[PDB]
Amino acid sequence: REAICIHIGQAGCQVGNACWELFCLEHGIQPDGAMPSDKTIGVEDDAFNTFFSETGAGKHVPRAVFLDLEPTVVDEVRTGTYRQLFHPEQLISGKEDAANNYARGHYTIGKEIVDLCLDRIRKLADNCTGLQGFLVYHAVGGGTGSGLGALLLERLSVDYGKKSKLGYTVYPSPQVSTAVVEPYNSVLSTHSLLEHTDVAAMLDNEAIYDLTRRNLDIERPTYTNLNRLIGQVVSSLTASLRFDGALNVDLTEFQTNLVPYPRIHFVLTSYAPVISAEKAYHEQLSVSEISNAVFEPASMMTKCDPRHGKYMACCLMYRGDVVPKDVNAAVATIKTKRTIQFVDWSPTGFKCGINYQPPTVVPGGDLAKVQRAVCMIANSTAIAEVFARIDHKFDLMYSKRAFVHWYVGEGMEEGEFSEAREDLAALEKDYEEVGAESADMD
Amino acid sequence: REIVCVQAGQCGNQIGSKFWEVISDEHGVDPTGTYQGDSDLQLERINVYFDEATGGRYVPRSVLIDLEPGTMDSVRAGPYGQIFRPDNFIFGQSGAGNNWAKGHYTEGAELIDSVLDVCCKEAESCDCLQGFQICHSLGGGTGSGMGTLLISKLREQYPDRIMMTFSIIPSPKVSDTVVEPYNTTLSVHQLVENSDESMCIDNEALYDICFRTLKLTTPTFGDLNHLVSAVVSGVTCCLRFPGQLNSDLRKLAVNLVPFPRLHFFMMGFAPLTSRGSQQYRGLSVPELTQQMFDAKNMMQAADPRHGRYLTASALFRGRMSTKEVDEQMLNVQNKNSSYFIEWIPNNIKSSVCDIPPKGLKMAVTFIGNNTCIQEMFRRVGEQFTLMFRRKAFLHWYTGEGMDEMEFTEAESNMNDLVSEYQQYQDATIE
């Protein structure tokens, strides 16, 4: 039933604004937190409870914390439109940023701020009766997102134990870049993330820019468009908890079906009917067409080509007016394709979900209105290419110790660079070994 | 996140006067000190540069120091001069005499305790202190000697903060004073040890900006100091207004400085164009990007074409798409690969801020770390070696008390800075 959302740094708070806008508009909570009084439906619905709690006077308040080291973005949330929705304790802000240093977030500053965050999360977890996981939003390219996100996930993993932790993660794009030191922060974050996350979903802004240029008709996109797409994805994955359906999927089912070995937990994500209103009237949008859409690499939100690897597991979530027979016929046709290959140790490659609630339409939004949609998360060996490129960038700079004195001054041993780089090398070898057919090895 | 300003010498006090005019205009503060702005966005970060005095008034967190009061009566007589706190003006009685040793050792030690007392008074009032900002010339007397003295004392007292300097260095072509090489060499020796990040400006580059780009018929030192005040007020804009991708002085330092001695940067500001031309070209991100890298728009005499970029940063102000910024920086990085140091995979940082300066649709400020800065120091060293081999004016400095070994120290330190830049220029992957 309940899920708690943790938003970290700039990308995570800005994506949070779009997410909570969407969840409000889908359930019907007004910005001040009160249900409309004009409606006379007579029934007193509770479906919001997954994301909202009531006090008793009928105000709604959401199950989220916003964490940042610079004040400006959280003060913007405090002064924005949803000011009255959030409890002021949930909006936590420090004095000064982690300055693109993972070391500053992890050792010096996040170590000071982390206990307030843990106390707020505890206060949330005490007001639950069927908590079934944490959702975390952060970017690994910046200093506070990497360092404090890792430290906080580590502490959560010791304190809460077996409870699942699902991450939505923005990785450094293969040619779009924002800071020079991105490889060091992403490697050091990823070292912690291997041990302390159950599934990690990776996003790259260059892919969502390409998708918004090609499919939507937007010449000059900005981050609000990307954040609305991410919000739609999160709403699709969590819809299985909130509405009636033929085949429900609990958050614990993802880890069981997608992860074959405990290190192999990084998955690719894509979403099908991204389409403009003018295109939407030239085309029908049947189940088989959107199922064919989710497999094209032009649909992916991470810049990787799955044709360079082998699939281990796929999870397909259908929402809206869909019938199981059409899903089965579509998946069998996909299975027929020659450019889609599964590892020979994974014969039963698919998990399905089917939910009746169609996707919500946001007044200012750019997606068309559609009766059905499908979303996929899948595990594939092609992912090894993203790490290999982050490694060469790390190796080229580390050969001259190009920036290390900042990290050592902010509290880190030089040894930690070599440890993390060797662990990622071993992860690369893991992806080579797992993909070798058994027939070749006799 | 509060900045403390220090203004030293004639050049520093004049540039400061223009800077505080620009800042008071951007936040809508009347020259009486009364807030008269028209949006809450102006008010909500006023604390960053102003302190609040009683019943309405705001006072600017700046210290003015000079060795002869001639300038101070001129700044008090200026149009915004009244805003400054009377107790914040520190002055001596006898002049610096254009001599570094006099400015550093005799009148320096006499005044320095009162300036440190004022700087401490200003620093300890902040709830959280960000770096200091200092404007001075290196060729002068009180500017060079007392500026570097004060920098050393503040660096002793606040080693974890940021130290930022804006500095004017003597042209090889149009000097106002004969003993410029000594004062410059000793000051650069002090700066390369003490500073975290230092910006250098040639008056010759500002004249070439004004004459070629702005086509001004009769430029004055007020125009040069206006260009400098524009960039100075631009660098801090992301500290004090909202935006889609916030940035900070510490984040700039972390992305710009690979090794702690390599902290000397080039400056530019893009939307400059003459009143006759303005009817012919609308503002857009491609236009700003083309002007920002054009050497016509850079404020030093050294040109990028003789060196390589280690790192660069661009801060954009205005309502604009992030896609255009990212794709412009990608296209320039891919298309121009020979001008970027190859053992760093991506040299440019971008930042985007929502609030432009009043009356402009968009603006960008550019900061560049390029090895061609070594050519300026070598040139200054040449003029020094010409003068020093013959002991041309040395008795003044020795009469103040300097050992000749100090001059050899300053030469060795500048030569080592030039050597370190030259070695990193010619480094290779192997």
């Binding site: 806008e21 409000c24 910005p31 609000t224 | 028209d38 909202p242 889609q244």
Partner: peptide, 27 residues
């Protein structure tokens, strides 16, 4: 002309995260 240019300086002070957001609920 003067009034238009005077009005053109007021709209330069705006934030972009809640650009155009109103919060009205579709029925």
């Amino acid at each position: 002309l003067h009034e238009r240019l005077s009005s053109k300086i007021s709209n330069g002070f705006a934030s972009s995260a809640y650009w155009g957001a109103t919060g009205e609920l579709p029925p």
